[PDB]
């Protein structure tokens with residue numbers, strides 16, 4: 001079971017909106033996690049006796065920047081970890097976590113970026129989701145915009161979250177229009193766009209890189225939640241998503257026995273496989289997370305309580321819940337992160353505090 005071994009507070013005293021363990025950290029190296037809040041990104045190392053060792057921060061030159069998200073990848077030639085961050089300015093920064101140097105930045109969108117995710121099988125492909133109602137897929141090896149997911153049948157309001165499935169063949173996005181939308185990226189059009197992004201070298205051609213504009217999702221529903229959908233994750237062929245209605249819903253497109261790859265864009269049904277209720281988490285902008293193996297699900301609430309669900313059961317509705325509290329932890333938990341082996345769970349709060357729970 002989990003025990004609270006340490007806590008820390010960042011000097012900016014502003015909310016921490018994101019936290020991610022580096023699941024690409026090398027064997028024998030201590031566990032490292034990044035936090036994002038205010039106009040900063042900070043790295044920490046987990047040590048024995050609950051020690052949280054402070055390393056170094058990246059501080060944006062714009063005091064008005066507010067980082068909302070971060071995601072780890074690694075350099076495709078050297079294997080060294082890389083960290084991407086973004087937020088209110090709509091700028092994607094690729095940071096070398098060793099020196100905390102910004103090694104490249106993309107003017108990602110014409111509005112804030114709410115989430116960043118790297119492709120599960122390709123470390124060069126970065127997905128950003130924005131307040132401009134679109135998703136964008138970047139190839140950070142050739143600095144190209146592969147595709148824009150949005151348009152005439154895309155999201156109709158700010159996009160808050162998105163996730164790749166296990167194989168990275170498809171994306172599920174969600175946002176302020178109450179909808180969850182599916183975008184297949186294993187179509188002939190998208191596989192060709194990705195191949196061409198890798199073949200693009202602006203020094204060796206005259207053409208600009210032509211980005212795809214994908215105006216139509218492969219599936220859409222507004223039948224799961226009745227408010228802003230602010231977090232989505234795939235659980236195999238099933239989806240986990242939440243709104244501010246004190247519930248994570250586990251569902252799937254189509255009827256009970258419909259295969260996800262047979263779902264057509266006109267599909268009008270959804271199937272609910274279960275719902276994980278909790279309390280006092282009815283404010284917008286609260287994230288849930290799963291561990292590496294997807295054996296566990298974690299979410300913090302607006303009064304500092306953590307809920308952890310054991311997903312190692314025959315059906316989703318049988319998930320077993322554990323609650324974790326500490327008398328000194330009373331601020332809203334915006335995001336959690338498990339270490340790759342799930343031995344540590346970190347929670348970050350609105351009062352700039354960091355909470356470490358060891359298994």
Ligand SMILES: Cc1ccc(-c2cnc(NCc3c(F)ccc4c3CCO4)n3cnc(S(C)(=O)=O)c23)c(C)n1
Nearest residue numbers: 119121122125167168169170185186191192194195198
């Ligand atoms: C005819 C052809 C076209 C495209 C690709 C291709 C595709 N997708 C990624 N990555 C994303 C990725 C992946 F990793 C695993 C599964 C997956 C995807 C995208 C959708 O399903 N690629 C990376 N390099 C390439 S390459 C060798 O430069 O083309 C790809 C391939 C293999 N063949």
Ligand SMILES: Cc1ccc(-c2cnc(NCc3c(F)ccc4c3CCO4)n3cnc(S(C)(=O)=O)c23)c(C)n1
Nearest residue numbers: 017018068114115160161230231284285286287334335
């Ligand atoms: C005082 C203050 C400042 C900023 C934010 C905030 C926070 N996070 C994102 N996005 C990241 C994001 C998200 F999209 C979905 C879920 C989620 C998060 C962060 C944690 O769980 N924001 C986007 N717009 C805003 S805003 C400025 O209110 O419109 C935010 C909050 C809640 N409070």
Ligand code: NA
Nearest residue numbers: 102103104105
């Ligand atoms: Na830079």
